Amino acid sequence: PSVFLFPPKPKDTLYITREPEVTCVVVDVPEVQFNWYVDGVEVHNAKTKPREEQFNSTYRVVSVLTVLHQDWLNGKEYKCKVSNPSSIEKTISKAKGQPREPQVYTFPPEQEEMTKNQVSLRCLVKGFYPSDIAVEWESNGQPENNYKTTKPVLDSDGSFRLESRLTVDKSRWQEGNVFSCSVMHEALHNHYTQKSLSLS
Amino acid sequence: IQRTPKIQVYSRHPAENGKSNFLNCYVSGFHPSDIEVDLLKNGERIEKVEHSDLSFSKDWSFYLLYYTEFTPTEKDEYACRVNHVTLSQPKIVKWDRDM
Amino acid sequence: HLSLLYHLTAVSSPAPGTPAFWVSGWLGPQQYLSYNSLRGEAEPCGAWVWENQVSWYWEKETTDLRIKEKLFLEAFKALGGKGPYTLQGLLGCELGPDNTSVPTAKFALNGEEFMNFDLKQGTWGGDWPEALAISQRWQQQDKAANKELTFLLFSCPHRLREHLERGRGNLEWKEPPSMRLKARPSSPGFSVLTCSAFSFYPPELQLRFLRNGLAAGTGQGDFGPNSDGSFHASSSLTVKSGDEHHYCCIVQHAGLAQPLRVEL
Ligand SMILES: *[C@@H]1O[C@H](CO[C@@H]2O[C@@H](C)[C@@H](O)[C@@H](O)[C@@H]2O)[C@@H](O[C@@H]2O[C@H](CO)[C@@H](O[C@@H]3O[C@H](CO[C@H]4O[C@H](CO)[C@@H](O)[C@H](O)[C@@H]4O[C@@H]4O[C@H](CO)[C@@H](O[C@@H]5O[C@H](CO)[C@H](O)[C@H](O)[C@H]5O)[C@H](O)[C@H]4NC(C)=O)[C@@H](O)[C@H](O[C@H]4O[C@H](CO)[C@@H](O)[C@H](O)[C@@H]4O[C@@H]4O[C@H](CO)[C@@H](O)[C@H](O)[C@H]4NC(C)=O)[C@@H]3O)[C@H](O)[C@H]2NC(C)=O)[C@H](O)[C@H]1NC(C)=O
């Protein structure tokens, strides 16, 4: 059997009314018992689901620890010890280092791509640290789903960067609708900023 | 976050048989604030039970005192039963006189 | 350095026949004040019931806590979002050496600190999106920030000074503990030594163990209130069964002139 320790979704770390959780998954298993530690000290508030059978006739066991928002932000370490030869430990945490504010740039479609059923709105996010970030889009203040975002990638200056592309219908753009790139990062004022874009 | 209640059971004055006293069940360190507390005599609930105001500590976790006027005896056993969202089953703590 | 702190709590979904908003008021470690949304009236608690107090004091506590009731319940509207919500507030003041008042104004959402009121600026703020939403709703409501400013910089310091003059007794009260020291068999070869302090005030108390007059450690301590604003504590130490009579328990307390040695 083998373990995989998963960090909280960044957006959950940044909205105090969302539930950030570390997910510790045990694969290729007959019963598993978990221990959890926060900067060495053990805690007892984890929640284990029942094992479940896979196509390949092995059991998968999942234990989740809810974490204090400010604890995750202060770089504390979450250790999930799996007991079943020995115990296997895994540890996870937020990267240490001077937090840095994301820079956000929006790019309208270049007339050339315009002659199409759909057009692509581009959002560049860079100069940020750590890599924990969430990106969303809105039209006239209401969420959009039809977008794609690259993984944070480290840049030559030791900061991270990332691109997001919102595909929309040509008409919706040419009717002059306000579109927004929304970025959630610990280093932003109230963990949120918005860059807005509309046909000039 | 969610926080599981700590449960202490103690008398207000030292436990003397025959002498009138108060039995306390202090429930603390819990979140959220919705919590059910019963004081038991011989594993059966006491109806004439009062409580302090639901309050909270510097860490924002809530606490609450349940108390009843009683007169302990050699034979009689008291306990505190607690239910909270963080508990899959009710939690029962017996009064041990030592503490 | 004595403090007056209100502990305020609102919930978006109160359980049947419990209040959506309630407040307990504290002068140091004693509750002097109770208010809830169902009764709608601030009331003295225990000994403060017969404080040498002015005729309108309780009407003015009521007025202020009703404005806070409305404010806390507006905050939920600014979140919209999902799940049920708990907004808690820790608002008060403490006296500083040269007739100065040091204020406190923190808030927590679902059990976690997220927002404070800046008394220099007269504004709500915190590091969190929910602090932006609630601050903006509050800051825009006519005179909210001014009554918050007034509650903390005028009302809390005056209330504190009046309670020091009119209720000096209540705060200087010294009830030293009644002590017990019992030994119970735990594991074969071993006993648990429990030192217990009953019905004491104030709450600061130190329990430690000696073995033949040498420090044998503090043990593992618990602490709790009684119904009457007095306190209880115990400390347990595990010991060699057949060794119990070599141990005693020492208690330091503001009520006791010299430390008190409790023998088995
Ligand atoms: C027998 O069957 C099972 C089942 O397979 C299942 O059967 C059916 C359904 C098939 O479809 C089949 O494909 C299924 O697998 C097999 O079980 C699998 O075992 C393998 C190992 O052999 C596991 O592979 C690892 O995957 C990691 C990533 O896993 C995620 O992504 C996939 C999708 O891409 C999902 O399927 C997984 O479930 C994981 O998904 C994540 O789940 C998290 C927890 O639920 C989510 O987080 C939580 O989300 C919730 C709500 O959504 C909350 O928000 C919580 O807050 C939050 O915590 C998360 O959203 C979700 N993410 C995504 C993207 O979906 C890999 O990371 C890992 O590879 C690393 O480690 C390897 C060595 O250990 C190494 O070789 C790799 O190179 C890689 O190394 C890493 O590389 C990065 C690169 O930057 C580094 O940064 C790292 O440091 C480095 N790490 C290390 C350790 O070196 C594995 O490849 C697989 O997870 C597991 N599947 C399941 C479902 O459990 C079993 O093996 C089968 N046997 C066979 C076929 O022989």
Numbering used by the authors:
A (entry chain H): 238 to 266, 271 to 325, 329 to 444
B (entry chain B): 1 to 99
C (entry chain A): 4 to 267
Question: What's written in the study?
Answer:
Here we report a structure-guided approach to engineer monomeric Fc molecules to adapt multiple versions of half-life extension modifications.
Using recombinant FcRn binding analysis, we found that MFc3 did not differ significantly from MFc1, showing an equilibrium dissociation constant (KD) of approximately 300 nM. This structural and functional invariance of the Fc–FcRn interaction was expected because the S354E mutation is more than 20 Å away from the FcRn interface. The overall structures of the MFc4/FcRn and MFc3/FcRn complexes superimpose with an RMSD of 0.35 Å over 3700 non-hydrogen atoms, suggesting a high degree of similarity. Now, with the help of MFc3 and MFc4 structural complexes with FcRn, with their two distal sets of mutations, we were able to gain a better understanding between wild-type binding interfaces and their mutation sets. The most significant FcRn interaction from the 252–254–256 loop was provided by Ser254.
